[PDB]
Amino acid sequence: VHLTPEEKSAVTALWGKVNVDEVGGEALGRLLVVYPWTQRFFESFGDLSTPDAVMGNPKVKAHGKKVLGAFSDGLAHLDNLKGTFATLSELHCDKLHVDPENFRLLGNVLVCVLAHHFGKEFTPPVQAAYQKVVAGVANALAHKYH
Amino acid sequence: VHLTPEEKSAVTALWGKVNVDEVGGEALGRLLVVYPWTQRFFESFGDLSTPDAVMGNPKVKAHGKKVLGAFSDGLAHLDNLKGTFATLSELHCDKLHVDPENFRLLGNVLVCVLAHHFGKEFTPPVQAAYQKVVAGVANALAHKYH
Amino acid sequence: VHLTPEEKSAVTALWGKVNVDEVGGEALGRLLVVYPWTQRFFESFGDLSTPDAVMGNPKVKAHGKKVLGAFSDGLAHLDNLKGTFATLSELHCDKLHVDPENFRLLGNVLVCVLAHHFGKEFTPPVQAAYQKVVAGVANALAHKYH
Amino acid sequence: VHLTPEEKSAVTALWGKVNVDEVGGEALGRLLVVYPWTQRFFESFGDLSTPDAVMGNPKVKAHGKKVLGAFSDGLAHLDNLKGTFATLSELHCDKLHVDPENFRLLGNVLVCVLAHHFGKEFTPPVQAAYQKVVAGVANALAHKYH
Ligand code: HEM
Ligand code: HEM
Ligand code: HEM
Ligand code: HEM
Numbered sequence: 115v116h117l118t119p120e121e122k123s124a125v126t127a128l129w130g131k132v133n134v135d136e137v138g139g140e141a142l143g144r145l146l147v148v149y150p151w152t153q154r155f156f157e158s159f160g161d162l163s164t165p166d167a168v169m170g171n172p173k174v175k176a177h178g179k180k181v182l183g184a185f186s187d188g189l190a191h192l193d194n195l196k197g198t199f200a201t202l203s204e205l206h207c208d209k210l211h212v213d214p215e216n217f218r219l220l221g222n223v224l225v226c227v228l229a230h231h232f233g234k235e236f237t238p239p240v241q242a243a244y245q246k247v248v249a250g251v252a253n254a255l256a257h258k259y260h
Numbered sequence: 261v262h263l264t265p266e267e268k269s270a271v272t273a274l275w276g277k278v279n280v281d282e283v284g285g286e287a288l289g290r291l292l293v294v295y296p297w298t299q300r301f302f303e304s305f306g307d308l309s310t311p312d313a314v315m316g317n318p319k320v321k322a323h324g325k326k327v328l329g330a331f332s333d334g335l336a337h338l339d340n341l342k343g344t345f346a347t348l349s350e351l352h353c354d355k356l357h358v359d360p361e362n363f364r365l366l367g368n369v370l371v372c373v374l375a376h377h378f379g380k381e382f383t384p385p386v387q388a389a390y391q392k393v394v395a396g397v398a399n400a401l402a403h404k405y406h
Numbered sequence: 407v408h409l410t411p412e413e414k415s416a417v418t419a420l421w422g423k424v425n426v427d428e429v430g431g432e433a434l435g436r437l438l439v440v441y442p443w444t445q446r447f448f449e450s451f452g453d454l455s456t457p458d459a460v461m462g463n464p465k466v467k468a469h470g471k472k473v474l475g476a477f478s479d480g481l482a483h484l485d486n487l488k489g490t491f492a493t494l495s496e497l498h499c500d501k502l503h504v505d506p507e508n509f510r511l512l513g514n515v516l517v518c519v520l521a522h523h524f525g526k527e528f529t530p531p532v533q534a535a536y537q538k539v540v541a542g543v544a545n546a547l548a549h550k551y552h
Numbered sequence: 553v554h555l556t557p558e559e560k561s562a563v564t565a566l567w568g569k570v571n572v573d574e575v576g577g578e579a580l581g582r583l584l585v586v587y588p589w590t591q592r593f594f595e596s597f598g599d600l601s602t603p604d605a606v607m608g609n610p611k612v613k614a615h616g617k618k619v620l621g622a623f624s625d626g627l628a629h630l631d632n633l634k635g636t637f638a639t640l641s642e643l644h645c646d647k648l649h650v651d652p653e654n655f656r657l658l659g660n661v662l663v664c665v666l667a668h669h670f671g672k673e674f675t676p677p678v679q680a681a682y683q684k685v686v687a688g689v690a691n692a693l694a695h696k697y698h
Binding site for chain 4 (some may be wrong): 428433436439440457459460501514517518521522525528530531533534537
């Protein structure tokens with residue numbers, strides 16, 4: 115990832131204020147609603163049969179928080195997303211066999227939640243910069259396939 | 261495209277409240293900022309060298325109006341998108357050689373721009389519903405390649 | 407999916423010399439080797455942990471003959487792709503939750519397999535028409551998500 | 553790009569047998585036939601309106617060789633794809649505005665062309681490795697957008 119210094123400062127000025135509970139629940143719930151094939155990764159979590167069921171689901175909510183913590187770390191290490199994510203790459207690729215496309219799609223969902231939460235401060239350039247971050251994190255997650 | 265009763269009703273309702281003059285222009289502007297290669301189709305519109313020149317460009321705006329009204333037509337014809345866009349497919353495909361992937365990408369941008377503006381009313385099932393709509397429109401635009 | 411009368415004759419002609427006991431299994435196996443996440447759909451098939459294991463697996467080859475028969479059904483009914491895949495789309499989407507991207511991949515794998523077996527008569531236009539046919543197939547298999 | 557010592561050994565021996573004057577022209581040509589939107593980048597090239605026009609265009613073959621040669625540079629330096637391609641990445645991204653997806657599609661075409669000229673030597677593992685390699689090159693060409 116390269117961010118312009120104007121992009122960079124903005125991107126992290128905004129992350130400072132992110133509610134991980136709201137953003138994490140919204141992001142992961144919306145993945146499973148918008149892209150329902152993804153549910154077959156979380157059969158364990160229980161009831162995922164409707165949007166209310168997915169969104170209220172406490173394990174869905176709790177796992178989104180953890181997902182966001184990882185992105186929080188990606189953020190604090192944009193120079194080496196590939197090392198930051200090396201072990202998560204091994205988990206999702208070697209063991210979970212998550213399709214790399216789903217990494218992209220969660221990324222894109224995360225972006226549209228942030229437009230939803232960053233409000234007026236979510237300008238075209240701030241949007242461009244977060245799309246780069248979640249694309250780099252996606253590529254880094256899929257690294258054990260490459 | 262298949263939508264359920266809930267979905268369609270909230271779809272059109274949210275769509276009722278969209279500004280005709282502003283949204284297409286913000287989505288078309290955002291596409292060219294986030295995905296800067298798409299600028300190659302619009303160089304005759306003027307200066308696209310910075311985010312500010314893309315977003316403020318009057319042709320980008322004015323053209324975005326036509327883009328938004330095309331989607332509007334699509335919403336009115338979800339039954340027959342392929343027939344609805346047959347003429348715009350010839351234009352984009354045979355004459356302008358727009359990559360199918362760019363159609364997809366504008367739809368995703370239009371989805372974030374809705375999420376940005378309608379915050380809480382852009383529920384997960386309404387996002388799912390707009391995702392299905394824009395991808396349908398993208399497919400029908402790409403019909404000439406197929 | 408549009409082919410010219412030139413296109414379909416070339417395509418059907420070539421299709422006639424496709425070894426139906428092996429091309430299917432070759433494409434399924436190459437899918438499984440080339441994009442190893444797809445293996446999560448077939449864990450009841452026995453040993454898949456080496457290229458050799460995969461390519462030898464009798465249930466890969468058994469299955470591929472069935473895959474190949476469904477592409478022949480597709481090739482016969484290009485004006486009725488959606489309808490022709492209605493039942494498989496129910497299976498693959500509502501029962502098996504296969505990601506749509508994987509339908510596209512298998513298609514592309516089937517393309518390189520044909521090229522691998524034919525040469526002489528696998529002209530640039532036949533390759534283009536087969537890509538179209540397989541993209542039509544994948545889009546029909548994903549119908550239930552649309 | 554990681555390759556296994558067997559993949560690397562096999563991949564290099566195959567590339568040893570590639571006609572550097574022809575395979576790259578066949579790739580670029582088939583790209584232009586199969587995914588005909590890519591024709592719009594080649595503004596110098598004259599007539600691209602039929603498959604013969606694309607495949608025998610002198611500039612298609614001459615440019616094809618340059619492309620092939622750059623792929624050799626990558627296959628030689630698999631630990632150093634970002635560096636090997638930095639200058640091409642500027643060109644393609646900043647100056648020419650080539651969509652990443654198209655870098656990927658050119659890769660996939662090349663893979664099939666190889667499949668087309670090699671037969672059983674083109675094992676499932678060798679296909680897998682080339683797909684890795686070509687995706688690596690696509691990602692290093694798109695570096696300036698990231
Ligand atoms: C793209 C960004 C993503 C990030 C940053 C991320 C992050 C994480 C983290 C931090 C864990 C917890 C691992 C542990 O310590 O044990 C995890 C687990 C998991 N992730 Fe992801 N993930 C991502 C995408 C995906 C996607 C797209 C899927 C599936 C569609 C997925 C499926 C899973 C599953 C199934 C688990 C195991 C959860 C469990 O413990 O039950 N992840 N992920
Ligand atoms: C996916 C939804 C899209 C819709 C609904 C749409 C709709 C339209 C409409 C209505 C026109 C004008 C018809 C006329 O006035 O003669 C048009 C023109 C055009 N569109 Fe699109 N379009 C879409 C996507 C794209 C994309 C992704 C690109 C390029 C990145 C693109 C590039 C163009 C260009 C270059 C023109 C001609 C503009 C001019 O010179 O006046 N469109 N589109
Ligand atoms: C793209 C073209 C595809 C075609 C034409 C196709 C065709 C078929 C057919 C005809 C069946 C029914 C078999 C039977 O009743 O015995 C089937 C089953 C199945 N397909 Fe597909 N398929 C395709 C893609 C995929 C992909 C991409 C996946 C996963 C990566 C997949 C996974 C399965 C599975 C898991 C079954 C059930 C397997 C079993 O229990 O034997 N298919 N497919
Ligand atoms: C993905 C692998 C690719 C490689 C290895 C590659 C390599 C190169 C090379 C070596 C050059 C010439 C550098 C020079 O002579 O100054 C070049 C120029 C170019 N490439 Fe690519 N390229 C790739 C993909 C693409 C794609 C997908 C497109 C468009 C669809 C594209 C469009 C061009 C254009 C328009 C030029 C300039 C042509 C000219 O000089 O007239 N390339 N590429």
